[model samples]
Target: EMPQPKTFGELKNLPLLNTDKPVQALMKIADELGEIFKFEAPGRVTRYLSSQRLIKEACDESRFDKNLSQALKFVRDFAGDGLVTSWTHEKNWKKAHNILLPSFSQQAMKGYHAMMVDIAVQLVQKWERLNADEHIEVPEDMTRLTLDTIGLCGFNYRFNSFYRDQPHPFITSMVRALDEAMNKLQRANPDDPAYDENKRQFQEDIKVMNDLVDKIIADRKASGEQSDDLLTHMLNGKDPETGEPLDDENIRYQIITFLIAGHEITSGLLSFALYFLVKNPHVLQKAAEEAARVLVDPVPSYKQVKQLKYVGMVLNEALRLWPTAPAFSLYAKEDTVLGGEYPLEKGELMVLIPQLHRDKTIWGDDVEEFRPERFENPSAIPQHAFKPFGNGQRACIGQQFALHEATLVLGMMLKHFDFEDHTNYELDIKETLTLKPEGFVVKAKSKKIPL
Candidate 1:
């Protein structure tokens, strides 16, 4: 039975009031179904999945093709056309992906390690100056550290984020642009009164961000001198498929994309890792002992951080509990049936990574508990599971870069200071484009290094 449409006295064609259901309840209903569920509308139907088999099937590129063009429309629409995500077709994506992947290669990472260590040491020094008992927002501090890291390591630019109490304008605009992009996606209706205001500011912030990247690219181009950095590779490298150099626009988008993507997830992981370590002293003690042994030098080398196996386990566990890029949409290129059962005309799919990460069926009885040991020998875990980054070819190419960077930073911090939980600190997570800790403060007690 259809509900009667009630109208106001003067307004004959009034729209009905909005649905008052809370999003919290809405979020749970889909996951409660256990495997996969369907959302059917007047003429549109979308399916969501959390099962490893379905997710792995979708990653096969042949069956369920992944096109970043449509896959990352919202991001490319705002960020620019030259981004690897904006490359759209597989040919272009493959070209750019191949060229850029090596820039984050093993040799490239070792060359970049010194800069990461320098920035981390700066972060430790900044904490060293702060009063021992004073509370510090670990999330905010980690964000700054990562911003400084990608700045130097990725582009050879330096942000000096810790030097200034307030973040730089470039950093603020990038954050705003991402937040606005996510908000734009979540809006229920275009007719909503607040949509126009939000759209206007979104355009304004994106312009600021793009302009900043453009200037950096321009400066790099005008300088003939070479440095061993990603930006250098981006500027000089040629697309192997086309055998032509990328244009200014393409290069700029690549730089902007790296900055935006690199910092957010890594910083959140660092913050959550700190929270877990403080709560679990045995874990913290173990990681600290490893750090003390490996990072006996003032700064950790790439080889040194790699040998810190327990630290790696701690990081992997933290990401399992709080995966930063929690969920993403995957679209099929053609009409296809899902999981050999559900038939679909329109081809779109959703995978809730957090749901998959914590699924008790796949993970054992202690799924909810923080156990880094599970990752100590992670080979037993099934394929297509444990994806903090996305799965398959489209997965984060910089996974190596992030893991090494995180390990180096954590090793240095653990060797230098012991973090304590503040009385008011609680795990109130901020749900934005990524998962981030909110109001999570910790007290840093500097440890004396015996000379």
Candidate 2:
């Protein structure tokens, strides 16, 4: 093992943007440095930890409250205030999180069921109508489908993304802006070659999303309608302690947060789920059989989806292999001890879920293979060994939301059609804000429905 850095001054300089594949590159460095090691970069001193034992302790709110890694903070900066990412430390995040928490509760999910299924049906119908000779480009299609789902389910807005030949201008601009913002974060130096240009483009992109959100909010408010949608909840949301309603500025930020966190990541997960299914036909066939037995209609209700045990397994396995936001870092709020051994000074915790999920010691020799059976009996696995949505107090609030939507969509598709992996499409993974499986194309054939 490499010698551990005794202090911030003794730590090796972490050149953040020194490589292209940040996720894998960081994982390699983290692996070489052992479970807990420190790195001193230009602006920050960070200690990285990937040990399961250390990771669980680091995530415990009482021991070490969450603080965003520098790169994550950059996201918060571009995203603006009132976003969960933008919220400082765990102590203050509860106010904003509490206001938005009810929006994702099961009762709220029930209200969104029909809307979610409707959008999902649109995707299935499109596939049924498409020419069998033509392979479906999964990334773009999933993105369009997810955008439509989030639009209707998020705020009762209809993007009709699938109806349009190209993505809506709103989507194009929002994506570009998010891309530039992530580029700014990924760079090793603030004075990098495209810093100025990326910043300018990012500024333009932020305005695009913000202006769009403002218009939507304004339209909804003027209509004087009330519903269980996210836009409505956020509009009426208030600081729990103060009872003051969130201002338009923060509300807009929250809407954008949903658009980014809610839609884009789900898009990636959906595409990856399909990829894994085709790669492992046995798993796909097994899941399809479950869907066939469980679902009777074209669209599955929220309750029907809950009964899809194998579909959940497939989705969970996909997330295990390709977590959308693969690597997220959480730092300690103050000086702390980890696992009763390592001492993590303030701002010294790094947990890489991607690496953790694939750990040979935890997952066995066939770590890289796609196997849904791993989740067949989830209890067989050790606690904290699988965390696609992460672990503990600060775990993703949308974890349930994402799983429900993915399972429902996959179930409906399986019931309606069969997918054959066609074309010489290799996995091209992209990581900006999330992990995306690019260039996955599949030939879909509609299945006969029994009367």
Against the unseen true structure, what C-alpha lDDT does each candidate score? 0.71, 0.74
lDDT of each residue in 1-451, candidate 1, tens digit only: 2112333344321212112221222235445665565533333334556666677666666666444422256677555654436543645466667678788776677888988887888888878888765877888888878878888877888888887878778777777777666555445575677788777776777777778888888888898657777788878888888886666677777777778766777788888888888888889999999999998776677889878888888898888888776665667767777778766554566666766677777788687688888888879778877888776666776777777788888888888888788664677777656667777888888896522
Model 2, 1-451: lDDT tens digits are 3224433332245544345567766667666766666656656666566666667677776766556666667666545665446644433356557777777776677777788887888888788888857878887778777778778877888889778877676677677866666665545566766587777666677777778888989988999788668888878888687576666777777777777776668888889999999988999999999999888865687888988999999988888888887766676767787778766677556677767777777888787898989989979778877877765656776777777778888888888889988875688887766777778889888896531
lDDT of 1: 0.71
Highest TM-score scorer? 2
> lDDT score of model 2?
0.74
- lDDT measured at residue 215 in model 1 versus the true structure, 0 to 100: 88
In candidate 1, position 281 carries an lDDT of: 82
Question: Quick one: best lDDT, which candidate?
Answer: 2
Stretches off by above 4 angstroms in model 2 are 1-18, 31-39, 88-92, 186-194
